[PDB]
Design a protein around this ligand. Structure first.
Ligand SMILES: *[C@@H]1O[C@H](CO)[C@@H](O[C@@H]2O[C@H](CO)[C@@H](O[C@@H]3O[C@H](CO)[C@@H](O)[C@H](O[C@H]4O[C@H](CO)[C@@H](O)[C@H](O)[C@@H]4O)[C@@H]3O)[C@H](O)[C@H]2NC(C)=O)[C@H](O)[C@H]1NC(C)=O
Ligand SMILES: *[C@@H]1O[C@H](CO)[C@@H](O[C@@H]2O[C@H](CO)[C@@H](O[C@@H]3O[C@H](CO)[C@@H](O)[C@H](O[C@H]4O[C@H](CO)[C@@H](O)[C@H](O)[C@@H]4O)[C@@H]3O)[C@H](O)[C@H]2NC(C)=O)[C@H](O)[C@H]1NC(C)=O
Ligand SMILES: *[C@@H]1O[C@H](CO)[C@@H](O[C@@H]2O[C@H](CO)[C@@H](O[C@@H]3O[C@H](CO)[C@@H](O)[C@H](O[C@H]4O[C@H](CO)[C@@H](O)[C@H](O)[C@@H]4O)[C@@H]3O)[C@H](O)[C@H]2NC(C)=O)[C@H](O)[C@H]1NC(C)=O
Lengths: 413, 413, 413
């Protein structure tokens, strides 16, 4: 009754026929090497070479590049005009990177009038707040997805096998099973990481980082991006100060201190993380976490008996073509690839269809294929503008790929 | 010296007497089936049938139903009355779902007076902001608790055993141990999940969702619930515009754009999750995560020797009665069930007492029972209004159950 | 080719030579005890005593003490002076714990003047909001780091070994390997935990707790610390009410309800956690989580064959001296200890260097030492003012330690 499947990564074994078991925890930032001449195959005249290599864990993050976080100074200036409307004149703050203007139009009923202006209900008094002394204070990225893997190389006799194993996965070679359990994520999807210096000097994790309502003083309030400045809103209140024969003066009741200055005063409240040999290219960040306390559990079984049974073996063949796509690249909501998967050589097949481009894969769907044609939907997260996403099974991908839409990542107002 | 205990789920075994070990990782959205005729019991004339079935992982979430998130339009209108107080008249905005009013009372010292109203320090000018064009944009739930389990069925010969195994737990039958490790939680307790459409189309995870201070423009600002509308506060400032002989006009300095419009502009900043075959009934949401990359580690040991020792075996008997309860159902703080647990047939017993109703269990306490009467406190989370929570050990529950209080889930102001 | 290393905690074994394997899941709040007389060493006349003890899991949190969260009442009062400036007089609100003042100076152009004050553009009207009826409502701590461990004691014959094992780590004695996998963290670094009563009655987890912009009504708005009060900002707007011959009155458009009152109205929206036997000393909180559903996977292997191979064995010797330090204690960003590590008796050595004081260790670096002198940097989190941080390998620490700087944990404005 059990139909064919390749979703289980592992073995059926008989322990009394196991030549060698390794079971151990290993730091993420540690590699591990083991070499031994095995005194079997009960042949004595000839021994069996055995190499096991496990590289340090590499972390891969698909990220949204957010630009440069800016520090700035708050300023306010007043501009009075005796007649006309507030549009009929330009203002000095309009030369600033970020500015917000409130206009008191057609209201100088003596109470608010300079000596030279004998008008009532005319003219305009313009109030403008602007930011200057802008300086870049760090680079920020929002995490779309996180991947954890270790390269593993196995040599049994004169046959070598190397593969990148994802965390909580197993590798199965003809006589060796290697499994990893326990890698846990300190970073989380949608975290914002901030680098006050080069990546090599470590980052800060910020759970509060403004997204939908960026107000001056919020974390991430002033961002300088490739597409120009992103300026914060000012939520305070304006008030026109007036006296006899004196020109009106603007007064603002609101926050004056920038988000960066607010964070540095309590800098030690936030979690840092350190990066060994980070690699940043476009929207991909890879690195090795140097924290020695983060450990995963490693199990190796060397078993050369005929009862050593790879649980994924099957005669099924899968042919793939990419039908359609919807959604966005570089998005935490993601894209959905619609695939046409043809099965031959089996009545049914339970397997995993992935969405991949030239660089890597971004998501995976477990599906139960029937002989002939099937439609499978795969959700991917990550990728970039030039990405042509393909349907893949193992290393076999469809001939043609499909580009996703640009993500909606913009402020309102 | 070791007293009896049933808290350890697992075995003591001798590996050289193990007939069969399976060790493998499996996607959460994958099932697994294995059938084999075992060529033992060294009897040859007769073989041993063996079935192993593992269902896809099911996720169970106890949720707080938050109602419908609403999109709306911001509006402001002015109402002047020449004499009397602002209470002495009704206003058009009072017909709206959400409205906020600020009244300028007894202040028209000429500066603020229409031509027809020759009064000073009398009358009132009422300012009112209201929301209209309300449309439902999705359904939101806050997660109280998360459970992960897989149904497992074992057939050895002509004897079958099926049980739901929780993640990071083991099942022990007479000759089979099955264990699961490594399932990790993407959703977290107190997350808010938002469904812009039917559950089958997936949800959005929102770390920022207003709870204690809902302001217009916040995520979750305007909620339409069974108990009526929940309206956001407006934190901006009002100002009475005045000119000669013209009637006063209200002006507001504050946010105008709704929370929903703010999110959609940056929709791709947030994490989505997808649901296969979701089931929603009252405050319970169950589903299968279709993400193929989420794997758990599965270990099966088939061992028929007399040294195969179930570590939970014991002669102890436990009788239960539900004494008292405090706390709330449907709450992330929870309720505390106070139980009276009588032990017989053992001098002491280390065991787990659970809080359960008709549907499921909601929490568990490990306790060291002494022969005779004991008091045990169990913290549960979840449940609903009709829940009668009982003290249980294994499948044995107390005769009577106790209802918890309603949760405090309300805005102030 | 493989150089020496002690980073792998575990064994190489032959399963057919294993006398006994235990494999089981165990609640965190449960201990486990196993005693058996092993009928080997195939000697029959003499048996082998075997004890295995596993204590309940203990949670250790390095915390930032935040003081007492305060509830308060909002108040506003007005003070008019006919002449002079607003500084020329004191005010009743200046006697309050928290107060904020806005001064309307030199503006009484008749419109705002009491009958007795015949001045224009002179005097001042001072507006002051203050908080009273302050009452402590709980104690709050921000989590810097979390550690999970179980004490384990092994007796084989007449030889005993006890050690605290960290989660996801293994202990290796001459013939026993014990490993733990699967402990997962419910609390997270940078979480804020709030205790409305004694620690024994449980805490509340709050993802939103004000850090960089504390506004009246935010969670954690009013904190009473050892260094005095920490007062919230008020972001609303002021307005001077005026009429004929009457003295001006202040009006505020802003939040009036405190953060504590706002939380209690929706108290059941937040996650609680319970503590068995908590220990608080300065900035260290230790406890046992009584939730019976949290389980870890335990594996014990008893194997007395000569092929039982501890993977960390090595002849290398390491000598340590503490060179320099930068960073802060009690910080989530942490400190960096710079160590001088001398290797002898090996050409190279892959090992872990830790940062420790008298109490415990706070971080760890995996490094590849060359024969002779090396510089290693270790990142630690936690500690306190008197901490002298040392470079350590295993139980061997440097003679002298170095104190870190105080953390920057202050509000601006
Ligand atoms: C692990 O990550 C943490 C967090 O990123 C990281 O902490 C950072 O360490 C750097 C390195 O020392 C700190 O940057 C220094 O800050 C001091 C004062 O704050 C400055 O004086 C330094 O600049 C001077 O020195 C330079 C040295 O050549 C000169 O080139 C320069 O012109 C200046 O004269 C220097 O910038 C930084 O402050 C912390 N970050 C925080 C948030 O505190 C830690 O070092 C990382 N550890 C490891 C082992 O990687
Ligand atoms: C996994 O989860 C994600 C997140 O939920 C999910 O993304 C959603 O996909 C749906 C399905 O296509 C999207 O809804 C569509 O949106 C487009 C434009 O945004 C509309 O044109 C669509 O409505 C039209 O088409 C319908 C088809 O019959 C008609 O009935 C209708 O009348 C309209 O004419 C449709 O609503 C949705 O936008 C996204 N969500 C987000 C946040 O982007 C994804 O599809 C899920 N994947 C799988 C495999 O389940
Ligand atoms: C697990 O953690 C949760 C969260 O901390 C915890 O819930 C708390 O339980 C306590 C204990 O009952 C509650 O405190 C009580 O609250 C009621 C009304 O809210 C008060 O009447 C109580 O005070 C009276 O009774 C005392 C008993 O002697 C008297 O000494 C006192 O003078 C008063 O007359 C009492 O304070 C608390 O409300 C909850 N917390 C929340 C947030 O709801 C739960 O009990 C913990 N469970 C276990 C098993 O530890």
């Amino acid at each position: 009754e059990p139909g064919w499947s390749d979703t289980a990564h592992g073995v059926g074994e008989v322990p009394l026929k196991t030549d060698l078991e390794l079971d151990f925890s290993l730091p993420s930032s540690s590699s591990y090497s083991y070499r031994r001449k095995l005194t079997n195959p009960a042949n004595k005249e000839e021994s069996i070479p055995f190499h096991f290599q496990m590289d340090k864990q590499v972390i891969h993050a698909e990220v949204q590049v957010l630009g440069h976080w800016m520090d700035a100074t708050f300023n306010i200036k007043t501009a009075f005009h005796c007649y006309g409307a507030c549009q009929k004149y330009s203002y000095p703050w309009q030369t600033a990177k970020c500015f917000f203007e409130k206009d008191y139009q057609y209201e100088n009923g003596w109470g608010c009038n300079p000596g030279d202006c004998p008008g009532v209900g005319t003219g305009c008094t313009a109030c403008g707040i602007y930011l200057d002394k802008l300086k870049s204070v760090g680079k920020a990225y929002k995490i779309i997805s996180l991947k954890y893997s270790r390269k593993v190389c196995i040599q049994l006799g004169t046959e070598q096998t190397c593969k990148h194993i994802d965390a909580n996965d197993c590798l199965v070679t003809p006589s060796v099973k290697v499994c990893m359990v326990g890698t846990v994520s300190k970073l989380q999807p949608a975290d914002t990481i901030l680098f006050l210096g080069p990546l090599e000097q470590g980052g800060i994790i910020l759970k509060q980082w403004c997204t939908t309502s960026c107000t001056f003083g919020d974390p991430g309030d002033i961002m300088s991006t490739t597409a120009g400045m992103r300026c914060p809103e000012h939520t305070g209140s304006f008030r026109k100060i007036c006296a006899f024969a004196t020109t009106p003066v603007c007064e603002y009741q609101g926050n004056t201190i920038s988000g960066y200055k607010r964070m540095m005063a309590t800098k030690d409240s936030f979690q840092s993380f350190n990066l060994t040999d980070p690699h940043l290219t476009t929207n991909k960040l890879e690195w090795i976490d140097p924290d020695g306390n983060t450990r995963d559990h490693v199990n190796l079984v060397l078993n050369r008996d005929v009862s050593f049974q790879d649980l994924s073996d099957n005669p099924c063949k899968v042919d793939l073509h990419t039908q359609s796509i919807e959604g966005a690249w570089g998005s935490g909501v993601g894209f959905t690839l619609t695939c046409t998967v043809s099965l031959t050589e089996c009545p049914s097949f339970m397997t995993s269809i992935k969405a991949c481009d030239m660089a890597m894969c971004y998501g995976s769907t477990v599906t139960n294929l029937a002989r002939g044609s099937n439609t499978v939907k795969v959700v991917g997260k990550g990728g970039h503008s030039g990405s042509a996403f393909k349907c893949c099974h193992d290393t076999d991908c469809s001939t043609e790929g499909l580009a996703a839409s640009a993500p909606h990542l913009e402020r309102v107002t």
